[PDB]
Amino acid sequence: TRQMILAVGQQGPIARAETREQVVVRLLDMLTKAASRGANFIVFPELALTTFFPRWHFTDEAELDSFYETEMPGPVVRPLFEKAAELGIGFNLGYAELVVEKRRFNTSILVDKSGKIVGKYRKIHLPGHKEYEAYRPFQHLEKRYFEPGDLGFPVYDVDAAKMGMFIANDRRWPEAWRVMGLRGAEIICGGYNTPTHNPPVPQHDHLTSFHHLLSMQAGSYQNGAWSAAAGKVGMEENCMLLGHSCIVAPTGEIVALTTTLEDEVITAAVDLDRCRELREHIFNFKQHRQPQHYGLIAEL
Amino acid sequence: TRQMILAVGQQGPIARAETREQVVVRLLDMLTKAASRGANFIVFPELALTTFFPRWHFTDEAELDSFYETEMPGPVVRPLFEKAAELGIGFNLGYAELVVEKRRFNTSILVDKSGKIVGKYRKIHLPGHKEYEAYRPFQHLEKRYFEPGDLGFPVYDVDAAKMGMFIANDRRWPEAWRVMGLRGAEIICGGYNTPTHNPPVPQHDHLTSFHHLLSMQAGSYQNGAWSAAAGKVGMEENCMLLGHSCIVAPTGEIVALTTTLEDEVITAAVDLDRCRELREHIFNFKQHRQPQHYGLIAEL
Ligand SMILES: NC(=O)N[C@@H](C(=O)O)c1ccc(O)cc1
Ligand SMILES: NC(=O)N[C@@H](C(=O)O)c1ccc(O)cc1
Secondary structure: OOEEEEEEEEEOOOOOOOOHHHHHHHHHHHHHHHHHOOOOEEEOOOOOOOOOHHHOOOOOHHHHHOOOEOOOOOOOOHHHHHHHHHHOOEEEEEEEEEEOOOEEEEEEEEEOOOOOEEEEEEOOOOOOOOOOOOOOOOOOOHHHHOOOOOOOOOEEEEOOEEEEEOOHHHHHOHHHHHHHHHOOOOEEEEEEOOEOOOOOOHHHHHHHHHHHHHHHHHHHHHHOOEEEEEEEOEEEOOEEEOOOOEEEOOOOOEEEEOOOOOOEEEEEEEEHHHHHHHHHHHOOHHHHOOHHHOHHHHOO | OOEEEEEEEEEOOOOOOOOHHHHHHHHHHHHHHHHHOOOOEEEOOOOOOOOOHHHOOOOOHHHHHOOOEOOOOOOOOHHHHHHHHHHOOEEEEEEEEEEOOOEEEEEEEEEOOOOOEEEEEEOOOOOOOOOOOOOOOOOOOHHHHOOOOOOOOOEEEEOOEEEEEOOHHHHHOHHHHHHHHHOOOOEEEEEEOOEOOOOOOHHHHHHHHHHHHHHHHHHHHHHOOEEEEEEEOEEEOOEEEOOOOEEEOOOOOEEEEOOOOOOEEEEEEEEHHHHHHHHOOOOOHHHHOOHHHOHHHHOO
């Protein structure tokens, strides 16, 4: 009822020449191993169907569009939904969304154990830069290839659980966590592509892991929420991406952690009633919060 | 100019029978050792002039009032201001404020190196409970003995530095940090009386340190602010108070930490320009924040 097993399916590199068909096989295998370890839900990474294309400057718009989905699911990704419904396991999938009216989003969905899309979220905090910067060995052009999401920070019923979505950079922003905490989220999940080199601030490179885990622990604790972060990790097209995919308790304790830079599955026992230990005491919102003093946070 | 040395003056226990006169001696000694180690400012704890009286139920209102200050400074505390002006060192002092119009506040002030009170703050987030609870070996009746502060989260010029104040429980609330981060605080400082036993949630007792330090590191990182937390610590009137008084860099790295449960002074080199490493890149607020999605945080 209130007890489930949450899984994270960390992805090793996806090369530029690796088809969605070859990625779906890798996702199917991880989704199968999570079932066999008793998982009811598995979190997959940000932009989980392709290489991280925002590392390149594009001149050809057909080449750029080829990394986006025009439908969800499409025939190549459909087998992942079919297998999820067969095994009775929900998932969180990140992908690049192209909607033609041409709007571009960094998107994620929640799929329940029936294989039904129960909710969508579009990345609101876009990191990196807008224009090509030649000094960078690799680019991070999310501000060019995506518009900021227009759906807000919703929380959806997924089987037994109140679940909210972040995408990568969102996890560093207390406002993203707090909104979803105020909407009663019991699990906050998403994925990331996080380089271990930041060209403008290389003096925080050795803190990549620290800053990632610090963000997940603080968000979980301050909102008494279970959380899970699914990385795409390792040497991808000669850029190193941070590992340390994780599941976190509402106390902010890390209860599971990846140790490889490859396809790796981790699981943890989730008790949704454990949110109360914070939300009815230390972080009893109605009882403690003084929102008349917080107005500057919501000012445009 | 943009470089200073920040000190923290951690306090061991203050017994019920220990006069303000005997505490000022202890504060003078710590303030002298900080000067000798090149400190330009020292952070002192919450309610630094008395035992932590909110651990007891009071029936007599004269007995309760005796723990509050009706003026700041008074003659007994005046020597601490005089010594601060002589040595050229500012301080942050917490005390119980009684103002008659009768209003009761958990208060802290910033004093610059001239010995002039440059800013006041009143604790906005009150923890614990309102009525006596007999099962508790000790009470935490801040909701009875204080009203929520009415000054907001201001940020003040103190010599070369933009400084904001929290008081104890405030440090667990992202909203307190964020408001002061948005007002351009370079240092966020205050003190705490944090029991290592929480009677309603004893299953988080072993996490007292973790939760304290997690709050300071995450606040600092997410706002690119220097921070400092001054504890009153050790066995005070048979209640154990958490140590681990700390200074933290804008990266959320702990740059100094106490290891005793006694009067202890720690210092760190503060470079106020280091805020830019976060505030001009990863946490470039104007460039990244989407406050149209954050409205629920400011709803009453
Ligand atoms: N994919 C993302 O949203 N990645 C960002 C993040 O994880 O917050 C990130 C972090 C460090 C960088 O050098 C670039 C981008
Ligand atoms: N002075 C304070 O505000 N103390 C509170 C805090 O530090 O958050 C606190 C923390 C844990 C408890 O079990 C009781 C009270």
